[PDB]
């Protein structure tokens, strides 16, 4: 509620209004504080969900999901600091403003009270993200990532507004989710498929199916300095949750056609992870993880029958961190050596000993050792999706193999002798290198102690 948007918009002139170089520490100081407010009135119910205003129930829903969104902001200025210190302050004042200008809508969205505040705010980004990709790129291939990032996201999300304005005047008012207490079903026709297909395909083009992901590595391979907005674009994607607000209801009873979204993404899950093994560019190698065990949720959501939402929620915020943090490693190791080519960096682990245990705990949580959230987020997937049909144990059982050769080959490539020609790579990871790389593995594993705070209603 205004408890949140108002201070975080109050942030906005906490920055430029300041002096010279004090700016970074000025806003990083406050931006942490809001996290007390983040929890503050939140983590109330529980049962019979919280709605505190007419057009906002901040998050009740058991999709808390908002606490993270308020984390990643003052993880950027620790992240983004590296080469952004080399241009002017009135531009550096900008890049902190639009970056907030993103953070303000992700608080608006995830609440939205309804469908039609979601959408205009579901499309309300792409103004702030697109401007961070095109400027402050690195290569010159960036200019095409500008377009491809649109012309999909916007391409098929217009058929929403044709459909959601079609519901508003058909049955009552969509003004509120919390009233669905009248919903008739959707039986069949050659019209209703389209309705269901229009109310869906806009979401898929964000969390990729194995088709129409053609943009995802185009934008991430070449993308701002620190992953500065690349950490944010790994929040944006998973935020396609809203399919959890719809497909639970609002055409419940068409599962009839589900199968082309099952067998299409269920054989890609065994697939695009395997086209990730021979990659020669590291920020590509991680970008294809992000498809894979993200695209497993799309077979979690379509199937009804909780024990999937038990396991589908834990995943949106499962790689929400692990897949975040890897883009933070591959950034750092790139500061020192200016190729992103994976081969070139070898013979590390002697020269940066403390950063050894940083790779490991990262690459260990794609392996998903049993105790952490990762498996307890996957093993509620397999338990329901097994009951669907027994044969799902094979493919998604293969996923649990190729992903293990997948991860290690990234670490074990950095255990070798190489002294080779590098006179660079002196800096022994000054604190920010290891400070911002923490505040992930500390908060991540921690939740396993009381992991009832990440769960759906079911």
């Amino acid at each position: 509620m205004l408890k949140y948007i108002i201070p975080t918009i109050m942030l906005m002139p906490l920055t430029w209004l300041s002096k010279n170089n004090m700016i970074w520490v000025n806003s990083t100081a406050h931006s942490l504080l809001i996290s007390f407010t983040s929890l503050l009135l939140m983590n109330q119910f529980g049962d019979n969900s919280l709605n505190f205003s007419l057009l906002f129930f901040s998050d009740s829903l058991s999709t808390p999901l908002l606490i993270l969104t308020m984390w990643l902001l003052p993880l950027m200025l620790m992240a983004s600091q590296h080469h952004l210190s080399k241009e002017n302050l009135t531009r550096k004042k900008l890049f902190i403003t639009m970056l907030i200008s993103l953070q303000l809508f992700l608080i608006m969205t995830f609440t939205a009270m309804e469908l039609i505040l979601f959408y205009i705010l579901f499309e309300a980004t792409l103004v702030p993200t697109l401007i961070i990709i095109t400027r402050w790129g690195n290569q010159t291939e960036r200019l095409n990532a500008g377009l491809y990032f649109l012309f999909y996201t916007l391409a098929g999300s217009l058929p929403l507004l044709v459909a959601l304005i079609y519901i508003q005047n058909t049955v009552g008012s969509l003004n509120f989710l919390m009233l669905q207490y009248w919903v008739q079903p959707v039986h069949n026709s050659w019209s209703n498929v389209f309705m269901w297909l229009a109310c869906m395909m806009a979401f898929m083009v964000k969390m990729p199916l194995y088709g129409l992901h053609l943009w995802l590595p185009k934008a991430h391979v070449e993308a701002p300095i620190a992953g500065s907005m690349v950490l944010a674009a790994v929040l944006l994607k998973l935020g396609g949750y809203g399919m959890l607000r719809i497909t639970l209801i609002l055409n419940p009873m068409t599962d009839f056609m589900a199968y082309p979204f099952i067998m299409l993404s269920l054989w890609g899950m065994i697939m695009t992870s395997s086209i990730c093994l021979r990659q020669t560019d590291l920020k590509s190698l991680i970008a294809y993880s992000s498809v894979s065990h993200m695209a497993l949720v799309i077979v979690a959501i379509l199937i009804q029958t909780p024990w999937s939402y038990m396991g589908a929620t834990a995943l949106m915020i499962a790689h929400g961190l692990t897949s975040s943090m890897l883009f933070c490693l591959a950034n750092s190791n790139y500061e020192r050596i200016h190729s992103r080519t994976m081969i070139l960096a070898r013979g590390l682990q002697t020269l940066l000993p403390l950063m050894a245990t940083w790779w490991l705990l990262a690459s260990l949580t794609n392996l998903a050792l049993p105790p952490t959230i990762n498996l307890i987020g996957e093993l509620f997937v397999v338990m329901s999706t097994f009951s669907w049909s027994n044969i799902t144990i094979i493919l998604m059982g293969v996923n649990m193999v190729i992903t293990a050769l997948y991860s290690l080959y990234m670490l074990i490539m950095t255990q070798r002798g190489k002294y080779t020609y590098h006179i660079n790579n002196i800096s022994p990871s000054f604190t920010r290198e290891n400070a911002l790389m923490s505040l992930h593995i500390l908060p991540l594993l921690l939740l396993t102690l009381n992991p009832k705070i990440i769960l759906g209603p079911l």
């Binding site: 170089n21 970074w24 520490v25 210190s85 920010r432």
Partner: peptide
Amino acid sequence: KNPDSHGYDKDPAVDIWNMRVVFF
């Protein structure tokens, strides 16, 4: 970025301030 200063974020002072403002 080592003229044998120790350093974390940027320069002489508030760098020292900038570490206690993150850690704490």
